[model samples]
Target: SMADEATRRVVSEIPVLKTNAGPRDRELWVQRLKEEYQSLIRYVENNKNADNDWFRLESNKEGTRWFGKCWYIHDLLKYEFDIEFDIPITYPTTAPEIAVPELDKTAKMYGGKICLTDHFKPLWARNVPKFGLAHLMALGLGPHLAVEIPDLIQKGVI
Candidate 1:
């Protein structure tokens, strides 16, 4: 049984990574890093082609740190925020902790971190090395934006 059809759809859409190594693993991690870049590029290209482009991301040389901007359209106005996260040393087992620095001051935030559904981490853990950074962008951040952006806009915070 599927926990979420939308999530299943997203999972099917984005390519999964086979490499399970972290940044400390040298050769294997570099393979994983290349996989990460390819997966992200594919997702971005698909998003652009679909006219649903909402974010742009880049990573540090090590591919451990990532930062980008994500946006949501609210009543024809685009509300954008700086989004970032760092891969944990135990990554693929532990999910990235997403942050939106601009939203830190908003009522919905806890510090600079953007909150997601309680189900998110559990699901990510279940997927393990299969779920790459692009999956997190689409499955995790995308849902959060849908909920957070409109609320912030209604409250005059966006």
Candidate 2:
């Protein structure tokens, strides 16, 4: 029932559901969103220090970014991460931009970069899904972004 509610809400907000991108793409996004949302919920539920009241997801009009906020329970730290899904009209054929706002200013190598191998250029390859945007956000960016924060704060940018 929760998944159904989430699916309905997401579909209502993102009318791209009417497009010819087909049922599969729509279904995949909905499922992925549900899983990620559930993961966030579970993380909060398990972590006593988590401040669930502050967690949120929103769209960024200034840029093609989907925003999310979460707290690390171990340290009671709060973080805001941004994922840019502004794929070209030729999506699935082009890689979407994914970046975390907090880490964008730090690492020059991977910060704010689209994940794609040379083989997938101009097309979304099978490997792309293997390394879904969500996985990168939580597993890679979430940890590294916070690691960079202290340096940023020392420079008075925090």
Candidate 3:
């Protein structure tokens, strides 16, 4: 049932593009979602292997239907290493806030959170037309935050 639950959560959380929109707008949004999803998935998969930890698609414990979970690779090492993406109905127009629970105690740097910011915004959504959710997952997690967290921790720069 985990797989079913995961699938349901992902589908429910992802913003739905309007079919009635003009061809160009629809195509553009679709392509962006695809790229983001792909990058996210790849980042998760690679990080899992690199860190020897498992990552899953999970919903928030507070019963929010649309929030997605990005758990840490080494849960045992640190209890607070996870990221949550709150899916807004109007996405891209408003970037999701990427929060690091563990870093809250550490002084805030990089806007006190981990994310791509505007400079890397295009990488977050480049190829939605062909990739769909898979693309979104991949690109969504591709940002360098994952790799940087541990370094920050060690350097006392969280």
Candidate 4:
């Protein structure tokens, strides 16, 4: 009987991060998303460009998601795309899946989602609470713009 409580205390417990970004709670999720959205607002404002118009950020009334627009400028042409993302119910454990709505029918798609390649998925998985929509855009989608847009435009696909 003594072993039962003792075992529960340490020898049988699985170690875990208190805030590993994978907990399940609807209220916590909604709250964290609200905060993340505020962070995005400030992030966009901080990047406001009077000298250029390469990016844009907006949100929904219920705070479920945010919309981001980016332009891939390549040799006198700008390949533009819109990103629609709803925070995964898994919170920080899973990075949001983004899509370039206009680029949908192209070869870049697999299972209805843009192929971000294997490299990004592992990096995304480890980030958890520290990663959010902005980071995903800057790192995940940003490279896509640089690499893919040039082809899309040169082929008159943009």
Candidate 5:
């Protein structure tokens, strides 16, 4: 069954952590931005599963926001999943809001915004003021894709 095929692997890709930095430190945030960018490339290139078709990354020079997308392969369907990061002014004290425009009204969101959970609370909260794109995509969208993709297929919405 398709659901069985999609159930093979659903691990979240966690990015490196930051412990030395204090809250609301844009400088440290900037540093992490750079690292996450590169780490993303490696994850897509070397991840155990050839799940994603491709992904693109973009950011602002001012370091207040970042944008990203992945041509994700969901069983038999292909989706260009898009998300953005609006770095909070109180960052390092808060995690960025990741929005997946393609899956709006698809339940993983509330009021058109991404809603993360199922280890998201613990993982994200534990790293509060420090989580980044990787965390959201990994913990947030990762599980979402793992289940939602299969559900979408089984539901005949594709």
Candidate 6:
């Protein structure tokens, strides 16, 4: 794993999803979404137990729109950012569009989303059913914030 220690710890701990259903799958999607919740709950517990929690997230009734607040400690100050992502209909095949809505209004953020596409996108593509939503945060957004938030802070953005 190219990610730092903390990211690796998270990615290693969360349960990988197994189901191959998407939103249109209707009945099957329910089970798939349930797995997502179970995995996220476990991941959150892992972070809390390690005293390394950095974000809080929840989804809509359909479990497709996930939004959260992720924070970073920079210069002894806590900088919090609003983050969101959507589960595509082709999910498990297409990575979720991770976004920082506030940041998007401020900067291009590399896309309408963040930096996950160029680097972590390929990794996600390769991992498929093994990579759950929790894994995306751990492997993609976790390291992303470690570097991105600091840059934004220094640039007087944050």
Best by TM-score: 1
Q: lDDT for every model?
A: 0.85, 0.42, 0.44, 0.61, 0.60, 0.79
The TM-score of candidate 3 is 0.43
TM-scores for every predicted model:
0.94, 0.41, 0.43, 0.70, 0.67, 0.87
lDDT of 4 at 3: 34
- Candidate 4 has an lDDT of 0.61
Q: In candidate 6, which residue pairs clash?
A: none
Candidate 6 Cα errors over 4 Å, as ranges:
1-10, 105-112
- Alpha-carbon runs more than 4 Å astray in model 4: 1-27, 49-53
- Per-residue lDDT over 15-117 for candidate 3, one digit per residue giving the tens place of the 0 to 100 score: 4432222113556545554555454456456656667333445443331222334443333554234555554444544335555554654443344455443
Write one digit per residue (lDDT tens) for candidate 4, span 45-149.
Answer: 545643334667676765557677787667775666776766576767777777666677468865335778687777666545665665666567767767777
Order of candidates by TM-score, top first? Answer: 1, 6, 4, 5, 3, 2
Candidate 2's TM-score reads: 0.41
Q: Give the candidate number with the greatest lDDT.
A: 1
Cα shift from native, residue 24, model 2 (Å): 6.3
Q: Where does model 1 exceed 4 Å of error?
A: none
lDDT of 4 at 82: 75
The per-prediction tally of clashing pairs is: 0, 0, 25, 0, 2, 0
Better of 3 and 4 by lDDT: 4
- RMSD values for the candidates in order, in angstroms, are 1.3, 10.3, 10.6, 11.8, 6.0, 2.6
Q: What's the lDDT for residue 156 in model 6?
A: 78
- Please, what are the lDDT tens digits per residue for candidate 2 over residues 6-112? 43442232211112221136655555444444544444343345333433444443223455654433255554544444533333333455554455545443756
Model 3 C-alpha lDDT versus the unseen true structure: 0.44
